[PDB]
Write a protein that binds this ligand. Structure first.
Ligand SMILES: N[C@@H](Cc1ccc(O)c(-c2c(O)c(O)c3c(c2O)C(=O)c2c(cc(O)c(C(=O)O)c2C(=O)O)C3=O)c1)C(=O)O
Ligand SMILES: [Mn+2]
Ligand SMILES: [Mn+2]
Ligand SMILES: [Zn+2]
Ligand SMILES: [Zn+2]
Length: 144
């Protein structure tokens, strides 16, 4: 009964989200930079790569208005969220055993929104949005 936008909401502020974790220490960071000049980065413990990407999306929804554009490089986070929206109650749908709690608070947050655009872009270089948030969350977590 909720449906993500097929194209970016024109006018809405865009959040370039990212996360990174290190597998030896389970330390990591999640955060965002936006096209209206606001950024946030938080440090986490006992986390994974997949967890930190979801965490980034969560702060995006946390800190944005009713219409938000979110660009992620995590096809996992996009898929697991999108699969939850689409299988909106099925007597034939088992729920994922991974990150169940995190994916559930995101859903809660996103049900509150009026319009969300969520899109995947591959990790890439340049001086664009995904590139700034990459190195912000990669700081002290991985070499890039
Ligand atoms: N582009 C710069 C920095 C750089 C270098 C080298 C790099 O590898 C990256 C780099 C990132 O900065 C990322 O943020 C991510 C990835 C990166 O590779 C992923 O690869 C990835 C990610 C999320 C996922 O969800 C999946 C998934 O869901 O399957 C995968 C995936 O690999 O499958 C993800 O977020 C970034 C350079 O060229 O040095
Ligand atoms: Mn990423
Ligand atoms: Mn990245
Ligand atoms: Zn509106
Ligand atoms: Zn870019």
């Amino acid at each position: 009964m909720y449906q993500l936008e097929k194209e970016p909401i024109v006018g809405a502020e865009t959040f370039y989200v990212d996360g990174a974790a290190n597998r030896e220490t389970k330390l990591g960071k999640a955060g965002y930079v936006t096209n209206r000049g606001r950024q946030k980065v938080v440090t986490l413990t006992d986390t994974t790569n997949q967890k930190t990407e979801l965490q980034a999306i969560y702060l995006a929804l946390q800190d944005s208005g009713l219409e938000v554009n979110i660009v992620t490089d995590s096809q996992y986070a996009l898929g697991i969220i999108t699969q939850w929206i689409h299988n909106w109650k099925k007597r034939g749908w088992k729920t994922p055993v991974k990150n169940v709690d995190l994916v559930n608070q995101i859903i809660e947050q996103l049900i509150k929104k009026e319009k969300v655009y969520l899109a995947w872009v591959p990790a890439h270089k340049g001086i664009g949005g995904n590139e700034q948030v990459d190195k912000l969350v990669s700081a002290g977590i991985r070499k890039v």
